A = this chain, B = another copy of it.
Amino acid sequence: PELDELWKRVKKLVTELLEQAERAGDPEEIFKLLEVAAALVFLAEMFLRLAAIQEKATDPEIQELAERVLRLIKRLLEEAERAGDPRRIRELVEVASQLAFLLELFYRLKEIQERATDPEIQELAERVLRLIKKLLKAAEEAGDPRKIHKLVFVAIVLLFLLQTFYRLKEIQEKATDPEIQRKAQEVLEKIKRLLEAAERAGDPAKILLYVIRALLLAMELKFAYRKR
């Protein structure tokens, strides 16, 4: 498929960063260039998750979001080959790697959808992917990769919130501790309110703030329920 040429772009950028590290004198500059080259290799590893995402069992909403992410990654790698500033190349590769991390989270969400039995988890997964759809559309129109990084960061933490909602529902389905059950319903209701506020927010920074508040509340219950 199109991964054969995406890897061809990745392998070309790695050798360019490898040669740039040899012609550098500052050891801090040398290591920073090697970090970007190694991040491109890890980026190519995330491409191998597309085959599982493209399977017939995967929710077509996740498949369309993975396709938008692949086009954004290719666009950023193309721009990296038309950039000379090492800081500009470093930012472009980093945002492309952050976009590739969404593919790993898209795969984990696909596995969650395969096992989860609560219908509210599925309905709220579609609410989160709807919000990620908007963040991805804004990233496709943005020319500044710093703006793309912000929108992708919010999409990543939203998928964290979704996995967190799945874990809390799992605790609610199995916990025999009445205090854990009371805390779980309390946190789930607060998280649903915070998710509704994040859906009405037009500022990605406000969305991120609400999601962090929701992840903070649930992390407290997850630590209280852990085996130890």
Where the two chains meet, the residues of A that have a C-beta atom closer than 8 Å to any C-beta of B are: 1, 3-4, 7, 11, 14, 18, 21, 27-28, 30-31, 34-35, 37-38, 41-42, 44-45, 47-48, 51-52, 55, 146, 150, 153, 157, 160, 164, 203-205, 208-209, 211-213, 215-216, 219-220, 222-223, 226-228
> With A and B bound together, what is the CA distance between A222 and B4 in angstroms?
11
Are B209 and A21 within 8 A (Cβ)? yes
Please give the count of copies of this chain that the complex contains: 2
In the complex, the chain B residue whose C-beta lies closest to that of A218 is B41
Q: A30–B4 Cα gap in the complex (Å)?
A: 39
List 13 other contacts, CB 8 Å, given A44-B219, A52-B226.
A1-B228, A14-B216, A18-B209, A31-B153, A34-B205, A37-B212, A38-B153, A41-B212, A48-B222, A48-B223, A51-B226, A55-B227, A55-B228
B228 A31 Cβ-Cβ under 8 A: no
Q: Which of B48, B212, B227 contacts A38 (CB 8 A)?
A: B212
State how many angstroms separate the Cβ of A16 from the closest Cβ of chain B: 12
- By a CB distance below 8 angstroms, the chain B residues around A21 are 205, 209
Taking a contact as CB atoms under 8 Å apart, the answer to whether B223 and A7 are in contact is yes
Given A3-B228, A35-B153, A226-B48, CB of A41 within 8 Å of CB of B219:
yes
Task: Provide the bound-state CA to CA distance between A178 and B213, in Å.
Answer: 55
The residue in chain B whose Cβ has the minimal distance to the Cβ of A219 is: B44
A38–B220 Cα distance when bound, in Å, is 14
Q: When chains A and B are docked, how far (Å) is the Cα of A31 from the Cα of B208? A: 8
Of B51, B146, B212, the residue contacting A14 (CB under 8 A) is B212
Least Cβ–Cβ distance between A194 and chain B, in angstroms: 13
A108 to chain B, nearest CB (A): 13
Query: Which of A42, A52, A205 counts the most chain B CB atoms within 10 A?
Result: A205
Please name all residues of chain B whose beta carbon is closer than 8 Å to the beta carbon of A4 when the two chains form the complex.
223
Cβ–Cβ contact B3 & A205, under 8 A: no
Residues of B with C-beta under 8 A to A37: 212
| CB-contact partner of A31 in B31, B204, B220, under 8 A | B204
Find chain B residues with CB under 8 A from A203 CB. 27
